[PDB]
Amino acid sequence: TRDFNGTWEMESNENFEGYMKALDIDFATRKIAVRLTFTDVIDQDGDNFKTKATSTFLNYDVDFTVGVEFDEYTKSLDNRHVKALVTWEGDVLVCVQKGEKENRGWKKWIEGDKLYLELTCGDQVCRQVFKKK
Amino acid sequence: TRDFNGTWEMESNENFEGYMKALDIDFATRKIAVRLTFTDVIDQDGDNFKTKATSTFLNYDVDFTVGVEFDEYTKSLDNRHVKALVTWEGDVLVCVQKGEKENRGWKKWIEGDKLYLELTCGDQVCRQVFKKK
Amino acid sequence: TRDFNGTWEMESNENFEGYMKALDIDFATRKIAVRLTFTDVIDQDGDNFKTKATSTFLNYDVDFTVGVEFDEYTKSLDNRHVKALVTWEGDVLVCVQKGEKENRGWKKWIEGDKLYLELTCGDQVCRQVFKKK
Ligand SMILES: *C/C=C(\C)c1ccc(-c2ccc(N3CCC3)cc2)s1
């Protein structure tokens, strides 16, 4: 068909870096641009096209069942493969991500009406606190 | 007027990078900051101001008519001028971007509820697929 | 509790830089990621979880009273110390930030119902226009 009207949300993006290299894009811009997805709005009249590309910093999705191991590729992080397992420890949700990196995983728990999140890798621990919106 | 109250959506931003360079902001940060737009919410009571600046990625717009060449400045890319032509090859939308870089352009086509996009420049090809939203 | 259901708005984020370095994330990416906040949406039915982390740019706040000097450590910028003063010059709001950089400040004014903002540092000017939304 020749009908390009619609709102189009990117689902895959292959060799974006090489293309950018051909245009003489600097390292920093390339290293950010590779972490984006795009939604593109095409408004087409006959042979008149108006198009708008929208850019966004690419979400981190992850689905799991507690105690069910699952493969995880950490796109938009460090692009690694890990074998993740989430367990209950009391009321703490604990995830170990087995792979190249040592001590890798995270912890989630509720205290009060705040969500606590510990991100761990190696000897580094990142602490995050969330309030319900 | 002395009333700045409102929600203010950026319309243009010139020499943002030169201003940032004068402040000694590192190259990486500036290359990001130039791809943002800003909405500034101003709450002004008398001489008391509270302001909040919001950041978003710019966007990339482009209008054309099939078979009507048009000069194109590729902002937020490699910032070049090209004489672009979007033409039909069957039901594939074909774009040639004449300029310093050559074999530069793209091919777009619909199959099912997917839009396919090949970006080519030099010997590099980038493949992107979009789902209709 | 074991009920993680909700939409969770980040309130604090400690040692995010160290964690990312432990993951070998490139310098450019780390300088961006430190300017983001996250909203984590958790959909949990028993031990089944779906989670989506969304990224958004940290807002940049500044409150002031015209004619009252105040010290400023420039946060999302170049982290220098400045003595800031906002004064009226007719209906042009004028701000001087005294410090190492010379001619550092900005000018903001409404003409029509667009907002004009001139940012200055040294001999460099950045001109920005906003429309009221
Ligand atoms: C149909 C033609 C399309 C979708 C495009 C041609 C070039 C595009 C583009 C838009 C934005 C970006 N980046 C944001 C920073 C780099 C790269 C390429 S879309």
Ligand SMILES: *C/C=C(\C)c1ccc(-c2ccc(N3CCC3)cc2)s1
């Ligand atoms: C339940 C949510 C969890 C465990 C999260 C784990 C890692 C997250 C994340 C998302 C993005 C980034 N950045 C991009 C570079 C840094 C780091 C960590 S959420």
